[PDB]
Design a protein around this nucleic acid. Structure first.
Lengths: 519, 404
RNA sequence: UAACUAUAGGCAUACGACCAC
DNA sequence: GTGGTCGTATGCCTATAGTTA
């Protein structure tokens, strides 16, 4: 039996919680069950010696019980499992005084029992059960390394590549080893068939599939729809949820009844079409290499499918919330790749060979000029309809014969009024006024006006580090209806070249006096 | 044996490992279990310590690395206040320094009974098929700061015949020996101490601390200056005014009068030439008001320059550097963004121990998920420095590239 | 009603950095 | 001293999906 020593929390005594009001109808049935448990040797009779009581709900005791190390934190993914020929499932002293529980008319003494074995609904009950099971299975695992045994709560999953005659015999040998310690297991006729239902997954020896997922609905029903789509995202490759998530930007209300937008129902209707045709997943093979492919489906959305054989997917998924507002189609792709790289270590235990929709010419240009370091060991180029493309690149050296544009923007948070202007070496100048704006937005407006009026070859000088940092990157997002106009202008131009404030630099001083005239 | 207790008042998640690394760790842990170094424990122990697999050059085989970073912060009163290691200021000045690993020495001395539960670690499994094998240390573990503190009483006794012979510093599992002897003499004298280790029973890497001279930041020597050349210069030097109070840009700004094109050539006057030449002298001469403080923690920040170039700064307070320089590249075969950073961090850490004797806080220009996956591949040292991940400004990147 | 895992939102604190008075 | 804007990290809360007690 080998009992595991269990203690309590440092400065807490046992539960002194009293019993609940009478029922009488349930008490008569409880005596019959407790007498059988006492006869078997699960519980024993006690007297006034024990001061601890439990109403069986061990809610108060578990808060006083010591912390046990995780039984199973991350659940096994069906994609990480191996393909098998035949699979079989099997369905199965000092601390004893704290598990004491009391059961007629006006505060009667009450019947006193205490648990001798592991009580269900406790904290350390599944922890000790698995730890004891691992020690029992150890000799069987060493004697039979060809077979694979997985343990989950009370159920045991056994699978092998052996023939049906040889597999059926080894399960009986496993049963006899468990019955030595006193563990009840179902016989051949009582054993469940290969369609196993585990964690929502319908398991099979060669493939795996999930259970079939089946007017202006309310806000929480949208969250119910998102949860089902997120659950289906592991097997269904083309899943778009972002528009339903934008509707979830609402607050508090339980019955708001949020209406749908045209773009929200558009991706909702096409997701219904994906869920129509039944799909299945493939198990992992240690001999073949893992291959992952990346696709850009839209704004801030990425989808991936991991496969060892073409058209035979192991696991799919999605990536949306990579970084903040500033995205960069190259960086956000790499952030999505890093998510799968870590995911493959957990599931399969090795890094997959990637097939990205980006050229090696663009990959090298971005990561050499960027400050942040990264490494992708194995990746290849595959041409896809929505190819990742870098729009523009700024000049390293100033352009000859080009018109110089000294630009600056100033704003005040009172009344929210700002001015943006530019002064050229030739003599051209323009000053405009804006409403509901900040210093960051006015400086952003200043560059847009500088690219609106100028020619093809332009030299722009700005005093802000914020304005310089955005254009030097490639923001692909709904952020700044302003920046999207700036990017579009920079593509039209051939060559564009892009100082401390309040220092007295010629050119910058003349602009600052114009924009901060009324501010 | 010696009783060990935690700090009054005061469990880390295990990072997933590869299929090859897990099988390698199981082989080592089974060998250590039979020897009597570690033993299996049940689920009643809530304390956990991260474990990683690294590779060696001399041994060529896999080595077990346990990250005691979280535990060392809770046990700081034992190995610094109760049993602190003395540090001399004469180790930083030598001709040749040789580093040797003596981590196998701690596997003999037993650990405190009541303190064994805090050194427990878990080996992760592929797709969580097996519950995970649990172990705890019965002896002094590698990576724990209390191990050299307890062994110190025996370490001083065995180094006494060596110290009396030649009129040395111990940190973690590594031993640092400094000498002013010749190249051929240094290799022989180290072997004399190495042969002495075998008497007790326990078991191109060479450093030059005199060659760590701080390279000064040099300004571009240009024959003909343009507006764009001045504007880039003023912007860099104005930012550097808080580091060096001697730098001024006032006369360089008076060269630009009114709106001008970037290509326009501006001749330097008597005011501009005499200011710029003076600023170069301040960059060559060490800055005043910089001193080491034992009470404050050390900080190290690394910047990426590109084309296989990396620059670093060692400081306790912002804009007040104690040690600066640049690590280019381990030139030749195959080097990446992670490898060049991993080789840099280990080099900066080793330099920090010789001069001061403390591991600095590393500021890295890399993502958390990217670093934690690939750092184990090129890691060799047993000491794990505390690191953080931050943003790199454009101004600090363009300044330290001018450093020679 | 609670716990484990994953995803979608919001709020608050702290640090590094930037801007205005 | 106050507010806004980027990045990192922590916390806990409102919800969902799979599951269990």
């Amino acid at each position: 039996i080998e009992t595991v020593p269990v203690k309590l929390k440092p400065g807490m005594d046992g539960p002194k919680v009293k019993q609940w009001p009478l029922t009488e109808e349930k008490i008569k049935a409880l005596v019959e069950i407790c007498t059988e448990m006492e006869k078997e040797g699960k519980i024993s009779k006690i007297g006034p010696e024990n001061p601890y009581n439990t109403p069986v709900d061990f809610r108060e005791l578990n808060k006083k019980t010591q912390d046990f190390w995780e039984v199973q934190l991350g659940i096994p993914h069906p994609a990480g499992l191996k393909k098998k020929k035949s699979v079989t499932v099997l369905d199965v002293e000092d601390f004893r005084k704290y598990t004491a529980f009391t059961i007629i008319n006006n505060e009667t003494p009450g019947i006193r029992y205490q648990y001798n074995v592991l009580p269900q609904g406790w904290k350390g009950s599944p922890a000790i059960f698995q730890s004891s099971m691992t020690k029992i299975l150890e000799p069987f695992r060493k004697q039979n390394p060809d077979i694979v045994i997985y343990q989950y709560m009370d159920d045991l999953y056994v699978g092998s590549d052996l023939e049906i005659g040889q597999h059926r015999t080894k399960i009986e040998e496993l049963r006899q080893h468990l019955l030595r310690w006193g563990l009840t297991t179902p016989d051949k006729k009582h054993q469940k068939e290969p369609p196993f239902l585990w964690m929502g997954y319908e398991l099979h020896p060669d493939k795996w599939t999930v259970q079939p997922i089946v007017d202006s609905w309310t806000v929480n029903d949208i969250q119910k729809l998102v949860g089902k789509l997120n659950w289906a995202s592991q097997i269904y490759p083309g899943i778009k949820v972002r528009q339903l998530c934008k509707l979830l930007r609402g607050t508090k209300a339980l019955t708001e009844v949020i209406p749908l937008t045209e773009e929200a129902e558009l991706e909702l209707a096409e997701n219904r079409e994906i869920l129509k045709e039944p799909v299945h997943g493939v198990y992992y093979d240690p001999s073949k290499d893992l291959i992952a492919e990346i696709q850009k489906q839209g704004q801030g959305q990425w989808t991936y499918q991991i496969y060892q054989e073409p058209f035979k997917n192991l696991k799919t998924g999605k990536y949306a919330r990579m970084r903040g507002a500033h995205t960069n189609d190259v960086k956000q792709l790499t952030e999505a790749v890093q998510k799968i790289t870590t995911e493959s270590i957990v599931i399969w235990g090795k890094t997959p060979k990637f097939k990205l929709p980006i050229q090696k010419e663009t990959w090298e240009t971005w990561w050499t000029e960027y400050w942040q370091a990264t490494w992708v060991p194995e990746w290849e180029f595959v041409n896809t309809p929505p190819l990742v493309k870098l729009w523009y690149q700024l000049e390293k050296e100033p352009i000859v014969g080009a018109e110089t544009f000294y630009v600056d923007g100033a704003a005040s948070r009172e009344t929210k009024l700002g001015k943006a202007g530019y002064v050229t070496n030739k003599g051209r100048q323009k000053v405009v006024t804006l409403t509901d704006t900040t210093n960051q937005k006015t400086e952003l407006q200043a560059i847009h006006l500088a690219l609106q009026d100028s020619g093809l070859e332009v030299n722009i000088v700005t005093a802000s580090q914020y304005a310089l940092g955005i254009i030097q990157a490639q923001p692909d997002q709904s952020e700044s209806e302003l920046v999207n106009q700036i990017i579009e202008q920079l593509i039209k131009k051939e060559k564009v070249y892009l100082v401390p404030a309040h220092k007295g630099i010629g050119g910058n001083e003349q602009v600052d006096k114009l924009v901060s005239a009324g501010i | 044996t010696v009783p060990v207790k935690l700090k009054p008042g005061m469990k880390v998640k295990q990072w997933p490992l590869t299929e090859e690394k897990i099988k390698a760790l199981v082989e080592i842990c089974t060998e250590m279990e039979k020897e009597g170094k570690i033993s299996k424990i049940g689920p009643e122990n809530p304390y956990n310590t991260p474990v990683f697999a690294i590779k060696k050059k001399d041994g060529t085989k896999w080595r077990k690395l346990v990250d005691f970073r979280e535990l060392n912060k809770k046990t700081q009163d034992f190995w610094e206040v109760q049993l602190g290691i003395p540090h001399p200021a004469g180790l930083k000045k030598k001709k040749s320094v040789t580093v040797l690993d003596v981590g196998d020495a701690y596997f003999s001395v037993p650990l405190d009974e009541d303190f064994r539960k805090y050194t427990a670690f878990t080996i992760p499994s592929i797709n969580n098929e097996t519950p995970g094998i649990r172990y705890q240390y019965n002896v002094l573990p590698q990576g724990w700061k209390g191990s050299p503190a307890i062994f110190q009483s025996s370490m001083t006794k065995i180094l006494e015949p060596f110290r009396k012979q030649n009129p040395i510093y111990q940190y973690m599992d590594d031993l640092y020996v400094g000498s002013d002897l010749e190249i051929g003499q240094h290799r022989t004298k180290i072997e004399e101490l190495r042969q002495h280790l075998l008497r007790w029973g326990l078991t191109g890497y060479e450093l030059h601390p005199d060659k760590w001279t701080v390279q000064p930041i040099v300004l571009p020597e240009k024959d003909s200056w343009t507006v764009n050349d001045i504007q880039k210069l003023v912007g860099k030097l104005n930012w550097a005014s808080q580091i060096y109070p001697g730098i001024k840009v006032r006369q360089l700004c008076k060269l630009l009068r009114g709106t001008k094109a970037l290509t326009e050539v501006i001749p330097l006057t008597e005011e501009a030439e005499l200011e710029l030449a003076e600023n170069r002298e301040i960059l060559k001469e060490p800055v005043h008001g910089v001193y080491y403080d034992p009470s404050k923690d050390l900080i190290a920040e690394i910047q990426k320059q590109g084309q296989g170039q990396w620059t670093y700064q060692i400081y306790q307070e912002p804009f007040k550097n104690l040690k600066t320089g640049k690590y280019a590249r381990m030139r030749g075969a195959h080097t990446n963004d992670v490898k060049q950073l991993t080789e840099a961090v280990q080099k900066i850490t080793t330099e920090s121990i010789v001069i001061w004797g403390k591991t600095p806080k590393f500021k890295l220009p890399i993502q958390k998920e990217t670093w934690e996956t690939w750092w184990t591949e090129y890691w060799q040292a047993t000491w794990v420095p505390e690191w953080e991940f931050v943003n790199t400004p454009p101004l600090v990147k363009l300044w330290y590239q001018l450093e020679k």
